[PDB]
Structure 1
Amino acid sequence: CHPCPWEWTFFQGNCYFMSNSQRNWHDSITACKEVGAQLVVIKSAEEQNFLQLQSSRSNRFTWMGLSDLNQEGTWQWVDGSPLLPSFKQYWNRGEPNNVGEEDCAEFSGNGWNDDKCNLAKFWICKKSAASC
């Protein structure tokens, strides 16, 4: 028994996978569903730091499961949960700025950016670990 599939990273009871290819935001959602996972929904500050460190180290602009597609300026996770005020700190300086209509969130440098959902980026999937 092992908690996560091969090539997935265990962190605090969940399993994470960073892609090696690039897709747009909606196709990244589909990619995670196909492996029994979800485009990453962040639930804690420690989880944010863990994910941001990997995006920063790898120098990969990476989608997360967050959008303001339903209501411009109101950010919602793909599981329906709202972006809480304790997470506004992670936006990069000047973000979100919706320049040229940007409705999907990415890890970019040290924080988050809103970018065009049609752009191809890396993505991270998350699913719960098995108990061994």
Structure 2
Amino acid sequence: PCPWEWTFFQGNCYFMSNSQRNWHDSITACKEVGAQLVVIKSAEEQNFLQLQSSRSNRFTWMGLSDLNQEGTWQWVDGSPLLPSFKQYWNRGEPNNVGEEDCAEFSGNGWNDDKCNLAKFWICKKSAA
């Protein structure tokens, strides 16, 4: 079903890292094992993820950014951020303070931060 020590959720497998890497570095790592920097597809999936971070209080990268075009948030799979996800941003976010182009789970919601900072991350890939 899911690789050793990965967590199963609705037909998908997730891996909450223990190391901290910058955003692009997080991507090549999920790459190595055939997974993707978690792209959130549904409210249910988001609650589950947000809880994985919330419960351990770790800042975690997700596969969402506005690197290509400031203000225009897009998932690593290319799908644009849906208006129905705005609610997930923490108050005042995304504020792009000092140029923040990457989304992370922070507190009970999301925050945009500098993509060069080292954070925990989550990989995702289809279950067996």
In the aligned structure 2, how far is the partner of 1:99 from the partner of 1:82? 22
Spell out, residue by residue over 1:65-124, the C-alpha distance to the aligned partner (whole angstroms, 9 max, x if none): 000001111100000001000000000001000000000000000000000000000000
What TM-score results when the alignment is normalised by the length of structure 1?
0.96
Instruction: Tell me how far 1:9 sits from its aligned partner.
Output: 0.3
In the aligned structure 2, how far is the partner of 1:84 from the partner of 1:44? 10
SS at match of 2:92: coil
In the aligned structure 1, how far is the partner of 2:88 from the partner of 2:42? 12
Match of 2:120 among 119, 122, 130: 122
Spell out, residue by residue over 1:6-31, the C-alpha distance to the aligned partner (whole angstroms, 9 max, x if none): 11000000000000000000000001
Instruction: Tell me how far 1:55 sits from its aligned partner.
Output: 0.3
In the aligned structure 1, how far is the partner of 2:52 from the partner of 2:103? 16
Spell out, residue by residue over 1:18-67, the C-alpha distance to the aligned partner (whole angstroms, 9 max, x if none): 00000000000001000110000000000000000110001100000000
- Give every structure 1 segment of 4 or more consecutive aligned residues whose post-TM-superposition deviation is greater than 2 Å: none
Please, which runs of 5 or more residues in structure 1 have no aligned partner? Answer: none
In the aligned structure 2, how far is the partner of 1:7 from the partner of 1:81? 29
What TM-score results when the alignment is normalised by the length of structure 2?
0.99
In the aligned structure 1, how far is the partner of 2:122 from the partner of 2:5? 12
SS at match of 1:7: coil
Matched positions, count? 128
In the aligned structure 1, how far is the partner of 2:109 from the partner of 2:121? 15
In the aligned structure 1, how far is the partner of 2:47 from the partner of 2:71? 23
Residue 4 of structure 1: aligned partner: 2
User: Percent of counterpart pairs with the same letter?
Assistant: 100
Q: What is the RMSD of the two structures over their aligned residues, measured on CA atoms?
A: 0.4
